[PDB]
Amino acid sequence: TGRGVKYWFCYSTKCYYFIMNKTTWSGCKANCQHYGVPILKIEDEDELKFLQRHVIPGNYWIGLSYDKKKKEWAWIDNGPSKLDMKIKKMNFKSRGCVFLSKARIEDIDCNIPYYCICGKKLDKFPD
Template identity: 35%
Template sequence: DEKTHARPPRSGNGSDQENTKKTLKDENEALKKNFTGEFETVQRFIIYKQLQWSLYSNLLKVHTCPKCEEGWELHGGKCYYFSTSKSTWDQSRDDCRRGGGDLVKIDSREEQLRLRQKMDYDEDKFWIGLTDSKEEDKWLWVDDSPLNTSLTFWSGKDPDNWTGTNPEGEDCARMGERGGADDLKCWFDRSCKDPQKSICEKSAETGRVTRV
C-alpha cells in the first residue's frame, strides 16, 4: 500500500519577519517626522526670541547722559566751574582739586573758543592750568604734559616773564582781558601770586538708562 505522508505545515517565519520590518520602518518614519517637527519648533522658538530681543533692545537703549554738579557748566563732555572770587594760582588749583577737578587744560581750538565766549567783560580774567614754574620757558599743563606749541593762544609778545612788579617773573598763565586781546589769542603770563579768578575742569558724570 502506498503510505500517505503528511505535508509539513508551512512556516510563518518569513511573513513575521516582513511584518516586523514594516513595523520598524513605520516607527522609524514616525520618529523622524516627530524629530523634524520638534526641531522646526525649536528653530521657530529661537527665531522668535531673537526678534523679541531685537525689539526690546530698540525700545530700551542705554545712553551716556553727561551731567555736572550744580554750579558747574557742561560743555563737550566736560564740566567747567568759573570762579567769582580771586586767588593765587596755587590757591586756585587747590580749590579746583577740592571740587574733584583741576585748573583747566585747553586741548583744542574749539575748547578755547567755548571758554573765550564766556568772557564778556574786561574783568573776566581767569587762571588756567598752565605754568613754567618748574623750568623757565618750559610750559606744562597741570597733568605735567608739555604745551603743544602748535596749539597756543598767547597774546602779542607774551609770555615775556616781565619782572617789573615781581622779581620772580611771571610763571603762570591767565586768559581773558578782551580789551587787550584779539580773536582767541588771550593768554598772558602773570605772577602766580597775583589774585585772579580761575576756571576749574573735570569729567562729566555718565551712566543713565533712558527709554525711548
C-alpha cells in the same frame, strides 16, 4: 567758614567750575583740587574760544604754569595740548602763570588775584 562763589557748567563732554573769587594761581589750583576737579587744561582752539565766548568779562587762572625746575611751560596734567604750537609762538616772557580773558590768553605773576577755572573730562554719560 566758606569757600567762595562758584558755578558749574558743562559743554560737549566736559564740565567746568568757574570760581568767581580772586585768588593767586596756587589758590586756584588749591580750590580746584578741593572739589576734585583740577585747574583747567585746554585741549584745543575750539575749547579756548568756547570758554572766551562763555566767560563773564574777567581774568581766569588756567592750569598752565612755568616749571621753575625745568625751565619750561607745563599743563596741570603734564600732557601736551593742541594749543602748545600757538602758545610757544606766543613768546611768554614772565616766569609766571597763564590766565584767560574774553579777548585772549596771557602770562603774568602767579600771585595776582584772579578768577579761576576748573575743568574735567566726562568718562561716560552722567548717571
